[PDB]
Amino acid sequence: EMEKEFEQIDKSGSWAAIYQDIRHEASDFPCRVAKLPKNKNRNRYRDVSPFDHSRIKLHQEDNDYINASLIKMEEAQRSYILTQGPLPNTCGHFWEMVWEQKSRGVVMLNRVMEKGSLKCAQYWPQKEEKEMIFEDTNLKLTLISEDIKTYYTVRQLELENLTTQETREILHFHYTTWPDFGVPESPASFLNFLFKVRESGSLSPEHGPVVVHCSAGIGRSGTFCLADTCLLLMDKRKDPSSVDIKKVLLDMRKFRMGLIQTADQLRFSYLAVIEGAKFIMGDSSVQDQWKELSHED
Ligand SMILES: O=C(O)C(=O)Nc1cc2[nH]ccc2cc1C(=O)O
């Protein structure tokens, strides 16, 4: 069990070493397009770039680059796009990708302001009558409604291709109480939120991959997807002991660098998967426990 390992690592106080072992072992692929001079203003952080092999290309001829990667989890059979928080000049690009990738959901795990700085552009409308137009990408975006909970909010956004007037519904799941380089308040409130996302059908394979972002698209995003894929893997096999969390994280790191940015987010991952396993292994009733613990109203 992951849970014996957890107890071992906790007793020997060795989360930092375990985590460094992963960083050291992590994949190192080229990000030549990210680092082209022309794409300087499309990257939020100098030290966070998509690998060339997994980057999402916009379907445009001017410049197809966005700081986004496709994480394709083969055994689990789930894919995610992970991306940074859109820049003031890449919000058109962001929605271009959502449209082109046919995603149903966007999971946002940061706030616009954190630690007294701006971590992400206001890339979606905050009220119904004030839609956003992205002229560069010829997209309209409209807030259709929102459901504000204590520590997260779900919004229905309408995206219109202004070229064709085709419309799509996007669900936005905005976790608002997950600090940068921090962890969720509890496994229960994390899992409640993850399970909201799943319930919505935004992860389901009849849609494009979900878009996941934090500020860099790696620390909180990586933790969210690691928990999700590990639970999915345990769910298809019904064998918790067969899931090696560290190994699943190295597999995800083949597709984007830097996933899970701190040893405590890794520790937290374990807790989330160990708790989530109760539900996956057929105690349906813990879901509603999670919901009560999380104090969402
Ligand atoms: O948003 C997160 O969860 C996360 O991974 N953030 C960050 C990861 C980063 N790696 C290197 C620089 C850097 C900055 C941030 C940052 O947000 O400043």
Side-chain angles (χ1 to χ4, degrees), residues 47-148:
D47 288 346
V48 4
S49 291
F51 297 144
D52 295 319
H53 78 79
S54 50
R55 79 183 181 92
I56 305 291
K57 301 190 172 182
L58 282 1
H59 304 179
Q60 55 149 279
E61 281 182 6
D62 190 49
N63 180 349
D64 72 5
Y65 177 73
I66 183 168
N67 194 315
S69 312
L70 204 223
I71 285 47
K72 187 169 41 281
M73 301 306 278
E74 209 194 35
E75 187 183 23
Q77 308 247 245
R78 184 164 278 159
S79 286
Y80 315 84
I81 295 173
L82 273 61
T83 187
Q84 68 184 196
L87 266 350
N89 59 309
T90 69
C91 294
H93 307 152
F94 176 89
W95 287 116
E96 178 177 359
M97 166 180 76
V98 171
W99 185 276
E100 290 174 350
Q101 302 305 314
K102 297 190 178 91
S103 322
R104 204 263 192 266
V106 175
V107 175
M108 168 161 194
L109 299 167
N110 72 106
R111 301 186 327 217
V112 163
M113 171 122 20
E114 304 177 325
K115 288 169 164 13
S117 317
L118 296 173
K119 288 285 173 179
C120 179
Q122 183 54 228
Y123 66 87
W124 77 94
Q126 294 168 267
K127 66 187 4 175
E128 291 88 335
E129 327 76 82
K130 283 229 22 69
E131 57 345 298
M132 289 175 88
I133 289 155
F134 304 96
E135 294 190 276
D136 72 313
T137 64
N138 215 25
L139 255 12
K140 188 171 86 199
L141 185 73
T142 306
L143 184 64
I144 300 304
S145 59
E146 57 166 25
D147 187 17
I148 305 179

Side-chain angles (χ1 to χ4, degrees), residues 45 47-48 119 180-181 214-220 261:
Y45 297 113
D47 288 346
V48 4
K119 288 285 173 179
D180 192 0
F181 298 102
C214 37
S215 187
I218 63 179
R220 298 173 277 188
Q261 279 283 291

